[PDB]
């Protein structure tokens with residue numbers, strides 16, 4: 001392999017334990033998609049890494065030690081990550097959760113999720129996609145009892161990977177409650193598992209006897225959790241037509257009567273106007289948009305999140321709760337808070353809680369940017 005000399009800033013990252021190689025720190029770089037050995041300014045060995053374009057990064061540190069990347073290396077990787085997750089395997093209440101999370105498990109560019117009897121792999125750059133044989137071979141040694149597996153490409157977008165086929169749609173269990181999911185359709189699966197603990201809080205009664213508005217609902221997974229926790233009623237608003245059948249499916253799977261659960265297909269900015277005109281108000285408002293969305297407005301979470309808080313407050317009950325969630329990697333905790341304060345203006349409010357990624361979505365403790373989920377619960 002090539003020995004690569006790194007500048008002082010690149011060095012400073014490595015020695016504090018950051019695995020991510022950012023392009024800013026490697027402006028010199030005319031090499032790609034390969035494993036390298038990194039050296040300092042004065043010819044000292046810094047570690048083995050690989051190079052591949054991934055958003056703002058050029059690669060990842062693999063080990064501070066001199067190592068060979070091959071299948072036996074991945075077997076070790078997956079033995080360690082499996083061993084952190086023993087409790088997931090012993091409790092029967094949750095059958096869908098994350099097995100492997102990039103640098104959270106010491107190998108950036110790969111995630112792996114379990115969904116009942118099937119697994120899902122996601123490739124975040126062209127190098128890991130090039131070596132999938134050895135990644136998949138190692139995983140199937142360490143986890144031989146899955147019936148089949150699927151893949152997402154994150155860098156044709158989705159494909160069956162090995163073993164049996166899954167049904168187009170099927171039920172998994174999370175917190176003792178059923179959700180309808182699907183593995184071979186676009187980039188999403190019917191649920192973001194990383195919100196497992198926010199859903200659990202709702203099932204446990206955090207919205208009992210209360211009315212809930214759920215904005216950018218997707219498949220209404222937050223609404224079904226609230227309903228199972230005794231919520232008096234829920235309203236789930238999403239721009240996309242597909243939200244109807246995909247939401248109905250969780251409610252039928254839990255034998256829930258939908259008399260007081262309404263599904264709405266509508267732009268969230270139109271919903272705010274419609275709700276004000278009809279004097280609708282809700283005890284709890286859950287806000288969880290995508291990080292960037294396209295086309296009667298363009299939505300960017302960095303710039304426009306203040307708008308959602310501002311307009312939600314107009315339709316919140318006295319002593320109401322806002323649950324403000326984002327999965328954007330590019331917005332820090334402090335930037336997210338700043339958007340929220342901008343939305344509140346002068347209005348008194350209290351931050352009751354901050355929730356971030358659960359332990360299966362493991363994080364590199366040295367890199368704060370890895371913890372990309374932020375969920376604030378705010379009391380008005």
Ligand SMILES: Nc1ncnc2c1ncn2[C@@H]1O[C@H](CSCC[C@H](N)C(=O)O)[C@@H](O)[C@H]1O
Pocket residue numbers: 190191192215216217218219220221222237238239240266267268269288289290293294299
């Ligand atoms: N202006 C808008 N109004 C309503 N929904 C929108 C929108 N822009 C994007 N969306 C929707 O936002 C969703 C992003 S996925 C959001 C995940 C969801 N909070 C959950 O709990 O599972 C997509 O379903 C898309 O249809």
